[PDB]
Amino acid sequence: TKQYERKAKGGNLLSAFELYQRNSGEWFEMCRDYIQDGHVDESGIFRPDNAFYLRRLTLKDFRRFSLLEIKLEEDLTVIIGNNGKGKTSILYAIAKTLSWFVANILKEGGSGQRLSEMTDIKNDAEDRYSDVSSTFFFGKGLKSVPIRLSRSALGTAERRDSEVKPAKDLADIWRVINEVNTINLPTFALYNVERSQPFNRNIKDNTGRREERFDAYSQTLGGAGRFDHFVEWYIYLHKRTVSDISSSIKELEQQVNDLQRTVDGGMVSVKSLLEQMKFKLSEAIERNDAVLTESVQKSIVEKAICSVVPSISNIWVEMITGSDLVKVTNDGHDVTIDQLSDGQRVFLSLVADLARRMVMLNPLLENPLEGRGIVLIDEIELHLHPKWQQEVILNLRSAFPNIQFIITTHSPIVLSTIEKRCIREFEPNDDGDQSFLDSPDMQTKGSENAQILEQVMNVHSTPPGIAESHWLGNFELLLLDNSGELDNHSQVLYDQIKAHFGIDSIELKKADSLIRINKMKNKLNKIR
């Protein structure tokens, strides 16, 4: 129609797509360019012209929340609060919404997930129904994609309907355009506390193919990842790379060259091995000579893992024992995945799973990890030592620069690495009637952990329930009661402080300082 033509020529993606569907060249190319166009910035990072992220979330009578609004950052949002403030509820609400995009990218008219009629409606809500309303942005040509998931409580005779058509409309553009000519697709993932699990290599899932592109959407919002799928996929990649003869020739050529250098260096014992390898190389060359995309995919993921996971410097597959084993160099030692600590394994699992999915869904990017998507992570500090908590957000954002991260944490150490604008904080005595979340007053990025504890997390830097925590205060008060002179009582407490904290303790130095200052103040008073 002429109206659609005008809007489409103005840059409206939905109008362009409608014109494409009715006529089924011009309009197709508009849609495809809208999705694929972008540029490399000054830092060498690819940036899509049309970004995709969650802008705003509204919760009505959902779990603890009567009516709550959250504005999200395009890049990173961190939600903080005490246990029971609804941080996980917020992530669950978002994950259910995203399930509608995933379902419709996989299948026309696919069904996403639903709010629970048993648990998700606020217990004391007079209207016995709940609403989760989201708005997504996809460039200037599609500034608002509104979705509502709704559910009525189990007894209730009126039933409240969800509104998911806009999600389906956008997902249809991705699916249809991709079918005609391949495009990069968005990644959606949820990593909740269920990501901590025992590993068993023995169990293999025989449901679908791990090399098939849309397997990247399999259980993507289930909370755990599929680390098993990663391992299967990685072994697959390895087998294909080893089976490619030219890379094997190149690898064999490199091995022959390395062995020849050793023989030239005076090690005559390896001459027999060199001759064997030269024979193997000649045979490989003789066999019918023809870069595997599988080889590149493998390299990308290996680099991602090693860059993000601090203790891991290398990852590879061994088959020589007679079973396929993934091995890693962890803190300078070669180990199996099964031998990693739970903290290392769980974090490895997260990154491996995420990297795999991005590689599969972004085949046309030079760096597939620069793809688009929304990733939710609950309790990012789970099982991490403080040392690692100081690196984790920085590493993730470096590896995945165009993902919108929505994170929850209880860690001041994590908060010390993040800007205040990214932080959303619950009011201290909330009771689930606060209308809008806000950022803290203090700047967290680069600040001391003890300050973040007190100013942002509302916790004393010294434990108030321990008597020894009050001794210095009591000591000072005793000193001031006796005109600054150490009396019997003040001396006893001084000795207690010395005995408990030690001769080199900060606390004792403070006590000493108090003595010195007060003595000098008293002397001044006497002179006057």
């Binding site: 009011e427 201290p428 005595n429 909330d430 606060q434 806000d438 300050q451 007190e454 100013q455 509302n458 916790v459 004393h460 830097s461 210095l472 205060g473 000072e476 008060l477 001031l480 009661d481 300082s513 108090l514 010195r516 200052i517 000098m520 103040k521 002397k523 001044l524």
Partner: protein, 210 residues
């Protein structure tokens, strides 16, 4: 908290009369510059730097509707009902969080010197002053409880940190008393005590220095 000097009364309080008028009616931008002259851009009770700030009725408008448009009764307190919820000291807590209190048993900083009642330890607690009994103790105790001067972790933290920053300089000045003649050392202490009028938590810094 500081001994405040209430000096001159603004013109607008003459116009509005209690009973007829409500506090929602009166214009607040007329009232502020006289308070900002008195209070120095710092809170009446805690001495933070005012940024989110409201006019506070020392005796509240519910219990004392007679004492409403009275220049004695008004003070500039930290916090705001409007901009954000759940403020946890000073004006806002006196009403909401501090439950039952007799307003007679509170330090009014325009009338009284607080320094005779309150003591600021360098560890960052505020405590009753040394040797108080009966009513003088009860005022010190209830002022601390009702304005939440220890119980607000944000405030307890900020004050403790502010003092602990200066305690190298306090230590170092009182070593040099040995060496210098009196008039030079008395000038040095006069200077440091001059600077802290520009600072947050000025009472607590005074007690550390003096």
């Amino acid at each position: 908290m500081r001994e405040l000097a209430r000096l001159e009364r603004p013109e607008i309080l003459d116009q509005y009369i209690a009973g007829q008028n409500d506090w929602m009616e009166i214009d607040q931008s007329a009232v502020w510059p006289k308070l900002t002259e008195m209070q120095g851009g710092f809170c009446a009770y805690c001495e933070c730097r005012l940024n989110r700030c409201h006019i506070e009725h020392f005796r509240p408008r519910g219990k004392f509707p007679a004492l409403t448009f009275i220049w004695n009764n008004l003070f500039g307190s930290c916090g705001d009902s409007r901009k954000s919820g759940g403020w946890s000291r000073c004006g806002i807590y006196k009403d909401n969080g501090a439950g039952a209190y007799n307003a007679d048993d509170l330090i009014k900083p325009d009338e009284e010197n607080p320094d005779d009642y309150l003591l600021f330890l360098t560890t960052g607690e505020v405590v009753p002053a040394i040797g108080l009994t009966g009513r003088a103790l009860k005022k010190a105790q209830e002022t601390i409880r009702v304005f939440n001067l220890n119980g607000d972790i944000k405030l307890f933290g900020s004050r403790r940190t502010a003092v602990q920053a200066i305690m190298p300089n306090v230590e170092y000045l009182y070593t040099l008393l040995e060496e210098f003649d009196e008039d030079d050392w008395n000038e040095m202490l006069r200077d440091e005590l001059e600077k802290i009028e520009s600072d947050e938590y000025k009472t607590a810094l005074k007690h550390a220095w003096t």
